[PDB]
Amino acid sequence: YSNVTGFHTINHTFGNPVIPFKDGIYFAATEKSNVVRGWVFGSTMNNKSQSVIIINNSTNVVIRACNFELCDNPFFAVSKPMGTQTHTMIFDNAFNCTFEYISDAFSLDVSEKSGNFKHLREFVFKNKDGFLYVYKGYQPIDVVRDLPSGFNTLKPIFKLPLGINITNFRAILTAFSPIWGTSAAAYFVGY
Amino acid sequence: GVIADYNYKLPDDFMGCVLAWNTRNIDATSTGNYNYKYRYLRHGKLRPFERDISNVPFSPDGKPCTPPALNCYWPLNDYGFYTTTGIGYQPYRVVVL
Ligand SMILES: *[C@@H]1O[C@H](CO)[C@@H](O)[C@H](O)[C@H]1NC(C)=O
Numbered sequence: 123y124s125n126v127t128g129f130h131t132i133n134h135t136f137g138n139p140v141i142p143f144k145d146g147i148y149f150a151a152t153e154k155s156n157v158v159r160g161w162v163f164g165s166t167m168n169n170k171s172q173s174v175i176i177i178n179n180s181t182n183v184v185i186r187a188c189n190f191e192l193c194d195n196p197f198f199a200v201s202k203p204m205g206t207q208t209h210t211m212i213f214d215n216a217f218n219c220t221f222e223y224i225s226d227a228f229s230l231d232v233s234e235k236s237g238n239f240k241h242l243r244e245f246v247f248k249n250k251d252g253f254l255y256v257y258k259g260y261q262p263i264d265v266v267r268d269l270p271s272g273f274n275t276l277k278p279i280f281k282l283p284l285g286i287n288i289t290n291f292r293a294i295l296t297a298f299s300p301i302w303g304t305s306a307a308a309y310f311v312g313y
Numbered sequence: 314g315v316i317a318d319y320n321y322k323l324p325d326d327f328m329g330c331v332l333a334w335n336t337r338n339i340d341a342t343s344t345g346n347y348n349y350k351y352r353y354l355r356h357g358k359l360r361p362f363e364r365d366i367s368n369v370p371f372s373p374d375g376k377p378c379t380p381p382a383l384n385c386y387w388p389l390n391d392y393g394f395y396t397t398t399g400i401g402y403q404p405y406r407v408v409v410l
Contacts, residue, residue, distance in 0.1 A: 171367035189366065218366065251324050252362020285362045 126150075126269060127311040131157060131295060131304050138195075138293050140167055141311060147291070148312025149245035150269055154235045156180075157307040159198060160212075160294030163247075163254070165287040167192050169215055172286045174254070177294055180207055180232050183225035187284050191215035196292070202300040205233040212294070221284055234298055234305045238264035246276055246312075254282035269310055317359070319352040324361035329410020340404035341394035350389035 126148075129137040141147075143163065151158055159180070164173025169191040176185050179198075190213040199209035244259035259276035298305050317323060340346050354371045356378070370380045371388055378385040394404045 165365075166367050166369050168369070170369045172364050220364065249360055249363075251326070252360065283362075285364050287359065287363055287365050287367070289357075 124313075128267075128269065129293075129309055129311070130267070131307045131309075133304060136295065136297065136302070136304055138295055140290050140292055143247075143249070143288050143291050144313065146246070146248040146313070148310070149243075149247065149293075150310035150312060151241075151243035151245070152239040152263075152265070152267075152269060152308045152310075153243060154237065154240045155233065155296075155298075155305055155307065156231060157296040157298075157305065158293055158309050159296055160196075161291055162190070162192060162196065162294065163286075163288045163291045164190075164192070165289045167290055167292065169217070172218070172220055174221065174282075174284055174286060174288075175212060175294075176256070177212070178230065179210065180230040181227060183223070185221060185223035185280075185282065186216070186219065187221035187286055188213075188216035188219040192292075196294050197297045197302075198294070199297050199299050199302075200232055200234070202234055202298045202303070202305075207232050207296075208299070220286070221282070238266060239307070240264060242270075244274065244276055249288050252283065252285045254280070254284045254286075254288070256280040256282055267308065269308075315351070315353055319355055319358070320365070322359040322361050322363055323409075332408035332410075333405045336404050336406045337396055340406070341396045343395055343397040346394035346404065347391055349392050349394070351392065352388050353390045354386060354388040 160177030162175050165171050169189045173190050174187040196212050198207055200207045241262050246257040248255035257276045258279040259274045261274050263270055293309055354373055356371050357375045370378055370385050372378045372384040395402055
């Protein structure tokens with residue numbers, strides 16, 4: 123029952139600040155259109171320190187640790203009438219690339235849906251003994267807003283030995299362009 | 314000291330081995346191998362097992378720097394490897410398990 127900061131992405135609201143990691147975080151993902159697709163974990167959030175990017179690019183799951191020249195507004199662009207992702211505007215530069223992962227090939231639902239938020243993805247991140255503990259949960263719901271009361275065990279998926287400086291982070295959203303725009307989603311901070 | 318909390322920190326529970334050998338005729342030169350540097354400077358300290366190669370100018374006491382400002386300098390300090398010095402200023406090369 124602790125305080126959960128809700129960052130809503132609604133029509134003009136495109137919320138992805140630099141959020142402190144301080145000791146670990148609970149990422150919730152109230153989703154229907156897979157808008158939130160990534161994170162950037164670092165400390166300086168620029169090309170000076172090491173940082174890791176953990177994204178789903180609708181074909182793969184990519185984990186990459188470099189000195190990323192962070193775009194201050196990183197976003198994926200999906201054409202709202204076409205239903206296809208157009209842009210990969212993540213970073214301009216990457217160097218001293220420390221870790222590199224790409225997952226298996228797949229094809230994800232890129233399109234904007236309507237109605238209620240169909241699936242909830244619950245993620246828990248920890249920097250322990252220089253690992254990056256990444257834990258996962260998933261169950262379907264259908265609601266308009268307001269992260270529901272419930273109980274679900276989260277599972278370890280990735281024990282990531284990155285060995286990097288993570289004190290801050292930023293979510294990577296999806297901007298839906300029909301020139302930028304959104305559709306409805308929300309994510310949650312969870313210290 | 315400076316190695317752990319600024320350059321790279323090690324946890325105090327599980328560590329492998331220190332593979333260290335003498336590279337006096339490899340890295341050093343009797344005038345000074347001034348081609349290598351190390352961090353003395355960060356807004357804070359590191360967690361265990363953590364890299365940091367941030368060339369943002371910082372402060373030695375963790376103070377948030379908007380440079381040019383108070384105690385704002387470059388993160389990296391010299392080594393100075395001689396072949397005409399004792400073991401404390403000679404280079405070794407260390408592999409950690
Ligand atoms: C956190 O939640 C409690 C009860 O749910 C509430 O009293 C408190 O105001 C919340 N914190 C903030 C910052 O609103």
